[PDB]
Amino acid sequence: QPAHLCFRSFVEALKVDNDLVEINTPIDPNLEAAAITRRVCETNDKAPLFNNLIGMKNGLFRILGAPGSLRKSSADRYGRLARHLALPPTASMREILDKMLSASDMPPIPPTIVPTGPCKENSLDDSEFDLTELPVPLIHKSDGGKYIQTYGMHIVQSPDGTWTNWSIARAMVHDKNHLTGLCIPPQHIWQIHQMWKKEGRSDVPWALAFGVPPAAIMASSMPIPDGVTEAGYVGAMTGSSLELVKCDTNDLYVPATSEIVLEGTLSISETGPEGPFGEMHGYIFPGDTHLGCKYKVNRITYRNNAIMPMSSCGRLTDETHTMIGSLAAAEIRKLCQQNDLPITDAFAPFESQVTWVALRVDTEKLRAMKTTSEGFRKRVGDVVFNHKAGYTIHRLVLVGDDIDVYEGKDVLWAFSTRCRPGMDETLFEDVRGFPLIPYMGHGNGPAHRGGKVVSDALMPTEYTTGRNWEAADFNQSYPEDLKQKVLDNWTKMGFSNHHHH
Amino acid sequence: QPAHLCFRSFVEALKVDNDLVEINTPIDPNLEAAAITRRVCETNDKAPLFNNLIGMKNGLFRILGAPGSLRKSSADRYGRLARHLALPPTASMREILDKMLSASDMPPIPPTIVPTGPCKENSLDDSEFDLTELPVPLIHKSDGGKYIQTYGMHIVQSPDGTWTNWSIARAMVHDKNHLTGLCIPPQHIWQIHQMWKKEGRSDVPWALAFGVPPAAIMASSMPIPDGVTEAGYVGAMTGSSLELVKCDTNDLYVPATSEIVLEGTLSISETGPEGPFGEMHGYIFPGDTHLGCKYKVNRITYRNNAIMPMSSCGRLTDETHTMIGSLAAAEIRKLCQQNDLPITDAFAPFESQVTWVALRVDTEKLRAMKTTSEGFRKRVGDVVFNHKAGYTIHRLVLVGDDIDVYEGKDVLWAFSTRCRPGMDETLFEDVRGFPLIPYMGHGNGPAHRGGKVVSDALMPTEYTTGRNWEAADFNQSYPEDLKQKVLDNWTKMGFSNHHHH
Ligand SMILES: Cc1cc2c3c(c1C)C(C)(C)CC=[N+]3c1c([nH]c(=O)[nH]c1=O)N2C[C@H](O)[C@H](O)[C@H](O)COP(=O)(O)O
Ligand SMILES: Cc1cc2c3c(c1C)C(C)(C)CC=[N+]3c1c([nH]c(=O)[nH]c1=O)N2C[C@H](O)[C@H](O)[C@H](O)COP(=O)(O)O
Ligand SMILES: [K+]
Ligand SMILES: [K+]
Ligand SMILES: [K+]
Ligand SMILES: [K+]
Ligand SMILES: [Mn+2]
Ligand SMILES: [Mn+2]
Q1: Which B positions 145-204 lie with beta carbon below 8 A of chain A?
Q2: I need a labelling partner for A143 at 20 to 30 A (CA). Which of A219, A363, B152, B266 fits?
Q3: Which residues of A touch B483 (CB under 8 A)?
């Protein structure tokens, strides 16, 4: 099966790419696996596959860390993401995000039900598993639990059956047969959980599938629209109907090649202690436990030699940056275009801890709008910050056509030099805020509201008659023939120089 | 003579460091020398010494580009700056700025007058030079003149003789015997020029010395206090009285080993066209010429085989970033401490195009002040933005003790995650602004006023009871013994690793 459609195949692809380190000696799931993974992420090293995890019982489980993190080279920086999607490993961020948006103007391709698959190779009923006995990792030293769930997808369906959502939300072990996790607005797990709570008749049928098709985990991490079943979007994006099998204890459907599947219920009535957790913005607040949503596990099914993917998230760079940020930026780009805003490209700079999105503006189109900074800033922020796609993003930076928004240096340059603090910005205090950002949930103001800004790094003539500067750089401040002469004579003269490396 | 006290010796030091490329074939001062230099600066390459400059007449002149730019290695990144100051090439930014501040609590060491020096080896009177015939560089393709003056020091004295100022301000050739340049408030060349204008009796005696003692050009680039003679501050910093010779046509004194000296007057009545110029923030605005101060040149004296230093300034990284930013940050650090503010360190992040300064706070001292963010932000901004040392700086970022302000990544992390936009900031509209920043002089508001902000990236408990998080990083989220085990086993397990490279 192809790498994008089968996690086991994806692991093989990373090996074959020389982008894997198999660690066959014993590694402790208490901090050691996550520490190695953390180091990998901070240094853009090869992904670690822990084949010998202390306490692995009954085939449960190996760990793959850093599944969606960066490679060291610039040439294949995003290769691990490209391998989720059947793209060449040299794919640009623009190409990856276009691939992720491609299904937005295609008919869904609904999934195909098959009678069995590898995820049924082994099973454990309620009397045969204990989640506290599994080699669940402690990811950060002050975490409030063992976070089994950092890179699986929760599967829940609307009561009426019309919408089946796949998403990543964290979860930790509560006891032998329960998890706790985050289910917060405006996320689709929360929106569906609300529907069940209002019907008030039963707990929500649930499954959590780990080691799912890489193309499915990418969609799981993307804020595609309300009511849209991720399976059918992935089907359209890949051009292939995904093969699903039914759960044994409920009527939900899981990817046939899932490494590990939990089946059970998400309670409409019960909560339990959840967190703290080392989070995407790079912090943990010791002792900061709150009540989260509570899941009961009734059944585990799993592949022979099952592999649990894990995100050791925190400071740059991991899945929380490469996937949360970039895929929100992708959705935002589309949302802006669908609202008739002249946005060509969007990216969440890593340097902003993916709390910013830079929006590249088609300034020819802007000029034709005959508008002003104050008006345009307000329009853009109203579109984005009133929508779920804008949830995680606290600052939008508008930049003209000369800026490559996928290059953080250039975004920082434009922001720092073209946006006058205060005057060129509009603050938004009556929008939903992202509480996980420290300055929100642990800050001076409301955890859940405001703290958002549109920063306009368009220069004044970009609204009127056109750019009226040239950069003071090698590219723009010297004619072509001279630049080429300099480059041609560079090593001859005695200076230093390869793209791949 | 030592490298820090003699420019010729400094050039030798760079050679011997393997930090120089001597280019002995013909190079055009029309753009080619500056293009090579620009490429050097954008790639942190070796400094170029142009020994064969097309149009060099009567020993005038060779060019050294990138005299204060960065080296490629992290280990000696700042080595070219260290070589200005007699510091080891491995010196940290903290060590360089402490060296630059060391004279602030020392008695000046006044200069020593000597009867002659190398700068008297050759002379040209009014009938014998023509500044339009010299190989003055065109630094950027759209510059409004040939900028002879990018790395020399202007020398002017108060009418009463009590203060002799050395500073860098740009100047370009106007005609055979005049320059035009920038003389803008609150800079000391402007402040002294004002004194002469109010006395109204004569033009200002002036000299411009190129290829001065490297320690003197560093002080020339630093906003040491009003009324303080830079020569005596350099003397104290270096522990050595600087040797000066008298000009031939006026009673000012120039460094004995100056490569090239112009003697003349700065007019109290006349102006001429000046600019545009490719500037420190990375822009030029074609055709944007304004009236600037006008200098008359009466005499040139120069060393045999004179070398003109040149800054090909613009986008990162050159003298305008490494020297303007860092030395303003140094002065700001001291200014804050002298105002009883608990600031340990200051640096202007390159990523901000040196428009920000990050201020590291001693949070133990902050806690004892029993204050709030709104109060502390206002206090800091009033101190800094009402002072000349704060002129070029539009955003101050306050950070706690865990942040290394000399590391831009860490500043960006703190800013992005700990400062809530709007609520955690104070805007300052009634302070002097820096017009050269595009969003000021070419922006939506007053070119010369406002557009400044204090952004508080201290978290709330840093004011009260102490930091209440741990980072979600390898350093802080794993115990010491585990971290060391991981590092010790790193290459054994199969991952990738040298400090010098
Ligand atoms: C890649 C990724 C995405 C996480 C995530 C992580 C990763 C690795 C973790 C597990 C390591 C850390 C926490 N995560 C959470 C999360 N969203 C959320 O609501 N709660 C979370 O706990 N997200 C983001 C979430 O997946 C996106 O916002 C989706 O758009 C949600 O899908 P939906 O649009 O269908 O609701
Ligand atoms: C290192 C450096 C500093 C320049 C400078 C440049 C460099 C290379 C140039 C020449 C390449 C580009 C323009 N420069 C100007 C400048 N200050 C100013 O008022 N006008 C200028 O044109 N500065 C900054 C100035 O030197 C500092 O603000 C000093 O503090 C001024 O000294 P003062 O405190 O004695 O006035
Ligand atoms: K999703
Ligand atoms: K602007
Ligand atoms: K000075
Ligand atoms: K703050
Ligand atoms: Mn969804
Ligand atoms: Mn001065």
Answers
A1: none
A2: A219
A3: 35
